[PDB]
Design a protein that fits this description.
Blueprint (H helix, E strand, L loop, with lengths): L4 H10 L10 H12 L6 E3 L5 E3 L4 E2 L29 H11 L9 H6 L15
Antiparallel strand pairs: 1-2, 2-3
Helix pairs in contact: 1-2
The chain binds chloride ion (CL) (2 copies) and sodium ion (NA) (2 copies).
One chloride ion binds next to helix 2.
Subcellular location: Secreted
EC number: 3.2.1.17
Enzyme class: hydrolase
Length: about 130
């Protein structure tokens, strides 16, 4: 599923991400835009052999099991394919574990390089929330 901007903002809000660990909703929408272009089926392979999955591009070296990343952890205890569903529940629950691990949203390179320090509230402007 390819989400609309306000559609995704509303779904993330219902799943408890607005101000989760202090990150306003606009941060999460901006990260999803530049990680996946709002497409739940996005995958990208990394140089080290791991793969990033779903709307928030969660990586198989640490967070999910895809059966082809040797020596990886599965800290969210989920198959990586569950992160590609049109239902974003599994991606959100895993993202909550990631953002709590010590480095905040800096774990998402695109957030650091394209959202951090910008006017992220613009990503939810005009939405009925
Ligand atoms: Cl915001
Ligand atoms: Cl980047
Ligand atoms: Na929309
Ligand atoms: Na893994």
């Amino acid at each position: 599923k390819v989400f609309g901007r306000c559609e995704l903002a509303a779904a993330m809000k219902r799943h408890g991400l607005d101000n989760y660990r202090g990150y306003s909703l606009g941060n999460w929408v901006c990260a999803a835009k530049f990680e996946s272009n709002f497409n739940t089926q996005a995958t990208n392979r990394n140089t080290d052999g791991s793969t990033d999955y779903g709307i928030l591009q969660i990586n198989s070296r640490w967070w999910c099991n895809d059966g082809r990343t040797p020596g990886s952890r599965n800290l969210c205890n989920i198959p990586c394919s569950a992160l590609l569903s049109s239902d974003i529940t599994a991606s959100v629950n895993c993202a909550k574990k990631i953002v709590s691990d010590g480095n905040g949203m800096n774990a998402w390179v695109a957030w650091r390089n394209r959202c951090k320090g910008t006017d992220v509230q613009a990503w939810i402007r005009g939405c009925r929330l």
